[PDB]
Amino acid sequence: SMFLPPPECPVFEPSWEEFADPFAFIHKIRPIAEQTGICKVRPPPDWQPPFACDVDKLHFTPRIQRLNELEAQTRVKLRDYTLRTFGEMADAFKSDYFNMPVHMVPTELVEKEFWRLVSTIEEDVTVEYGADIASKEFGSGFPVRDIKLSPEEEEYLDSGWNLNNMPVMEQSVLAHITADICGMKLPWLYVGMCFSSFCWHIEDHWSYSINYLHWGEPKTWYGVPGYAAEQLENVMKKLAPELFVSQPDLLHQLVTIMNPNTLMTHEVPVYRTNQCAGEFVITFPRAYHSGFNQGFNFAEAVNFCTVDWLPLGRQCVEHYRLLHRYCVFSHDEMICKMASKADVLDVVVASTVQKDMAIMIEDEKALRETVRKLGVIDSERMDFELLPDDERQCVKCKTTCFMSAISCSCKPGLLVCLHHVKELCSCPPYKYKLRYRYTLDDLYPMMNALKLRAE
Ligand SMILES: O=C(CCSc1nc(-c2ccccc2)cc(=O)[nH]1)NO
Ligand SMILES: O=C(CCSc1nc(-c2ccccc2)cc(=O)[nH]1)NO
Ligand SMILES: [Mn+2]
Ligand SMILES: [Mn+2]
Ligand SMILES: [Mn+2]
Ligand SMILES: [Mn+2]
Ligand SMILES: [Zn+2]
Ligand SMILES: [Zn+2]
Numbered sequence: 146s147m148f149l150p151p152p153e154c155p156v157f158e159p160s161w162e163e164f165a166d167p168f169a170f171i172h173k174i175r176p177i178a179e180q181t182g183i184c185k186v187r188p189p190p191d192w193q194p195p196f197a198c199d200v201d202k203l204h205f206t207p208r209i210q211r212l213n214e215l216e217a218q219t220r221v222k223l224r225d226y227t228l229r230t231f232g233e234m235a236d237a238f239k240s241d242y243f244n245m246p247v248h249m250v251p252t253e254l255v256e257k258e259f260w261r262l263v264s265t266i267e268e269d270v271t272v273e274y275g276a277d278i279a280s281k282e283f284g285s286g287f288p289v290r291d292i293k294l295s296p297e298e299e300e301y302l303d304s305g306w307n308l309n310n311m312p313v314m315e316q317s318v319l320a321h322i323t324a325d326i327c328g329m330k331l332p333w334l335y336v337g338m339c340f341s342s343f344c345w346h347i348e349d350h351w352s353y354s355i356n357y358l359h360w361g362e363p364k365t366w367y368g369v370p371g372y373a374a375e376q377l378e379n380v381m382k383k384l385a386p387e388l389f390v391s392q393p394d395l396l397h398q399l400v401t402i403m404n405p406n407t408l409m410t411h412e413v414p415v416y417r418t419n420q421c422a423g424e425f426v427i428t429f430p431r432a433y434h435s436g437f438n439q440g441f442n443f444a445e446a447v448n449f450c451t452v453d454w455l456p457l458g459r460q461c462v463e464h465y466r467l468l469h470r471y472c473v474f475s476h477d478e479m480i481c482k483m484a485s486k487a488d489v490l491d492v493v494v495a496s497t498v499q500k501d502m503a504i505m506i507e508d509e510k511a512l513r514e515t516v517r518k519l520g521v522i523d524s525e526r527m528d529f530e531l532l533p534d535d536e537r538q539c540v541k542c543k544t545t546c547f548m549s550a551i552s553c554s555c556k557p558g559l560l561v562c563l564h565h566v567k568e569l570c571s572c573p574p575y576k577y578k579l580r581y582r583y584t585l586d587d588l589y590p591m592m593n594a595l596k597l598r599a600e
Contacts, residue, residue, distance in 0.1 A: 147260070147261065148256070148257050148260045148261075148406060148493065149403075149409075150256065150325040150417055151367060151405050151409065151415040151416055151417040152172065152416055152417070153215070153238055153416065153417060153418060154178075154182075154183050154184050154185060154368055154416035154417065154418045155174070155177050155178055155181055155184040155185070155188065156184070156185045156186075156187065156418070157170075157174055157184060157185070158186075158187045159185045159187075159188075159189065159377050159447065160189065160344055161189045161191075161192070164188060164189050164192065164306075165175075165305070165365060167305040167306055167311070167314075167355075168305070168316040169593070170186075170244040171353070171427065171451065172451070172453065175429070176455065178429060179370060179371060179429045179430075179432075180370050180372075181368060181370055181414075181416045182368035182370040182371060182373075182416060182428065182429055182432030182433065182434065183366055183368030183416060183418065183426055183427065183428050183429070183432060183434055184426070184427055185363075185418045185424055185425065185426050185427075186424065186425040186426075186427060187423075187425075188306065188369040188423065188424075192306070193423070194287060194288070194301040194304070194307070195288065195295065195297045195298055195301065196286060196359050196360055198228065198286075200227060200228040200229035200232065201227055201228075201229050202227070203224070203227060203228040203282070203283045203553060204225055204226070204227050204228075204282045205226060205228075205231075205282065205283050205336065205466065206224060206225055206275075206277075206285065207224055207225075207226050207273040207274065207275060208221065208270060208273065208274055208275070208276060209272075209273055210272050210273065210274060210341060210342065211269075211270075211271050211476065212259075212263045212268075212270045212271065212340060212342065212402065213263055213266075213402070214263040214264045214274065214401070214402050214403060215384060215385045215401055215402070215403060216401060216402070217289060217385075217387060217388055217399045217400075217401060218344050218399070218400050218401060218402075219396075219397065219398065219399060219400070220344075220346065220395075220399075220400055221276050222328075222396050223277060223278055223327065223328045224538070225346055226273075226275075226284075228336070228443075231273070231336060231338070231441075232441050234273070234438070235337075235338035235339065235440065235441040236441055238272070238338060238339060238504060239288055239338070239339035239440050239441075242339065242537075246590040247440065247441075248362065248440070250439075250440075251566065252363060252365070252419055252439055254363075255339065255340075255439050255440075256365055256526065259340055259342075259365075259394060259437050260404055260406075262340070263402050263404075264333060264404065267356050270340065272338055272339070272340050272341045272342075273338065273341065274335065274336055274337055274341040274438075275334065275335060275336030275337075275406075276333060276334070276335050276336075277333065277334060278327060278328070278332065278333055278334070278423060279331065279334060279482065284308055284335060285308075285332060285334070285445065286334065286357075286443060286445045287300075287304075287307040287308055287309055288301050288302050288307065288361040289299065289302075289309055290302060294590045305426070306357075306483070308332045308355065308445050308446070308447045308488070309332060310582045311332075311447050311449050312330045312356060312447060312448075312449060313493045314492075316449070316451065316452070316491055316493070316494065317449055317450065318450040318451065318452060318454065318455060318458075318479070318483070318494065318498075319352070319448070319449060319479075321482060322474055322478075322479050322482065322487060323482060323485065323530075324474050324475075324478070324530075324534075326473055326474050326480065328436055328473075329349055329350075329352075329448050329473050329474075330447075330448070331447070332445050332446060332447040332470075332474050333445070333446050333447070334443070334444075334445055334546065335441055335443070335444040335445070335446065336441075336442075337364065337438030337440075337442045337444065338438060338439065338440065338441055339362075339438060339439065339440045339441075340437055341437065341438050342402060342435070342436065342437040342438075343434075343435055343436055343437075344400035344401050344402055344431055344435055345377070345381070345400060345401060345402075345403055345434070345435040346400050346433065346434070346435070347374065347431050347432065347433055347434075348428065348430075348448050349448070349461070349473045350450075350458055350472075350474070350476070351371075351430040351431045351454070351457050351458065351460075351461040352430065352448040352449060352450050352454065352458075352462050353427065353428060353430060353449050353450065353451065353454065353566060353583070354427070354428045354446055354447065354448050354449070355425060355427050355428075355449060356420070356425060356426045356427070356428070356444060356445075356446040356449060357424075357425050357444065357445050357446070358420050358421065358422050358423065358424055358442060358443070359442075359443045359444065359445060360422045360423065360442065360443055360445050361422060361438075361441050361442025361443055362422045362438065362439040362440030362441060362442050363419040363420055363422075363438075363440075363442070364419070364426075364437075364438050364439070364442060365417065365418075365419050365420075365436050365437055365438070365439060365582060366417060366419075366420060366421040366426055366434060366435075366436040366506065367405045367415055367416070367417050367434060367435050367436060368415070368416050368417075368418075368428065368432055368433070368434045369408065369413060369414060369416075369432060369433040369434070370414060370429070370432060371429055371430055371431035371432045373413050373414055373433075374431045374432075375407060376411075376412070376413050376521050377433050379412045380399070380407070380408055380411045380413060381403060384403070384407070385403075387392060387399070388400070388401055391469065392470070394471060395471045395473070402409065402435070403435070405417070411592055413530060416558075419439070422442070429580060430454050430457045431457065431461075447570060452493060452494055452497035452498075455497050455501050456498075456500075456501060458476050459476055459501055459504065459505075461476075462476045462544065465542075465543075465544065466539075466542045466544045466562070466564065467542075468543045469541070469543050471538065471543050471545075472543075472544060472545040474545065475529075475530075475545040475546070475547040477505055477547045477596060478529070478530055478547040480498060480501055480502055480505060480593065481502075481547070481582070481583070483498045483595075484498060484502055484591040484592065484594065484595055485591065485592035487591070487595045487597070488594070488598060490595070490598055492598060492599055492600065493599075495594070495595045495598040495599040496599035499595035499596050499599055502588075502591070502592045502595065503592060505548070506585070506588050506589070506592065509548050509549065509585070509588075510585060512549070512563040512564070513563065513579070513581075513585075514551065514589065515563070516530045516551065516563050516566050516579060519540055519566055519567075519574050520574035520575050520577075521537045521551060521566065521574045521575070521577045521578070521579050522574075522575055523575075523577070523578045523579070524578060524579035524580070524581060525578055525579075525580060525581075526580075526582070526583075526584075527550070527580035527581065527582065528582065529546055529550070529580075529582055530545045530547065530582075536558065536559055537550070538560070538566070539560060539561045539562040539564075539565055539568075540559055540561050540568060540569060541561055541562075541564075541565040542558065542562060542564065542565060542578065544562050546560055546562055547582055548581070548582055548583070549562075549579060549580060549582065550562055550563070550579075550580045551563065551566050551569060551577050551578070551579060551580070551583040552569075552577065552578050552580055553569055553570050553572050553576055553577050553578075554576070555570050555576065556569060556570050560580070
């Protein structure tokens, strides 16, 4: 009546055989889980990675969070608690809030109460949490190579479900991005407390995320299937238009808390789950998700990109251009890097990259014909990958240039992508230069190498 819990998302319990290869598994469940946006995966009973830490030596800087529905919050960027003193604070907070033993409050009640307090103007609840990538002060919850590791640790060093390994596996596509994308390719560590919350969002470049709860009280999730992303955005834009104003950069992305019943009222499908310790949650491309912690806990999450995702990745960058949103990396640069390594690619990867590259090349061909017809005649090869990211964004749409751009000696260092030739300066186009990474004659052999590898 006050809060009606969304229907449960799918839960999978793979056999060790099914589980072993995360990429095969995710591909298998995809027709089901992409309809719900998120799903939960329970590992085989004896898949049990070792969790061991000195709570007195793990330190982190706490972030502070107000809990008001529809209020703007800023996406996190990469004071001090130890894990012990954070834990003591967190447990006392929850215990005091409910006047109940810290681990005896029903999950249904915490959820109900979360949605009450965020919607009540009178209530001014603030909580704290940890969020950052692994560091010497607070390392991964999974085993990593370095000290003498136990045999138990050794066993899980190379697991496909060890989140440190996920990015660099063979069927991962984000693997050999040579660009610095630490915030995206490295796992994030999250230390939660009762009500600490992550606002509604999708992943950068519409990637997947895989999320593991190492220990502690459950994490409550809400998820929306990718097909309803724009429906959700329209609902939010109606209720919180200030979140949709143009953002100056990626450090000023605005996100918010919003009751899933509000989405369900507006015919947006929403699913829920309680993720418990030892369980995975997977989010699918462009699947909006949000959630909050039931209590003191420790989670680890990483983005990843399969071959299934490649065409969506291209669509996402198109979408970013139309919205004038900054990119985390150049999709075309990633594609060309993979083509340049065609001989060592997994063959299914090679086949899928070939297809995206074909689209890339035909789009590039047409764009170059168009700018030639606008009077741009001079050209010069340019190694875009050498430029700092913030030195090769299109002045107009902020896209990260790689295949080509237009420059003018009138505006030293400024670039526009080929969609925005008219947005650079008032000089006539014959003053312009087409800067290009590859000629069309360079590109066809690169694509052919992929075809040969794919056989
Ligand atoms: O969750 C399961 C069965 C997982 S397999 C499964 N799940 C759903 C499904 C589940 C939740 C929401 C929407 C669809 C539909 C289907 O055809 N198969 N175990 O408890
Ligand atoms: O988005 C997710 C869920 C990861 S689980 C999580 N995320 C945050 C969080 C997320 C973003 C910024 C700040 C905190 C806090 C927390 O306690 N848990 N994976 O795709
Ligand atoms: Mn306890
Ligand atoms: Mn996320
Ligand atoms: Mn425009
Ligand atoms: Mn703008
Ligand atoms: Zn542009
Ligand atoms: Zn000029």
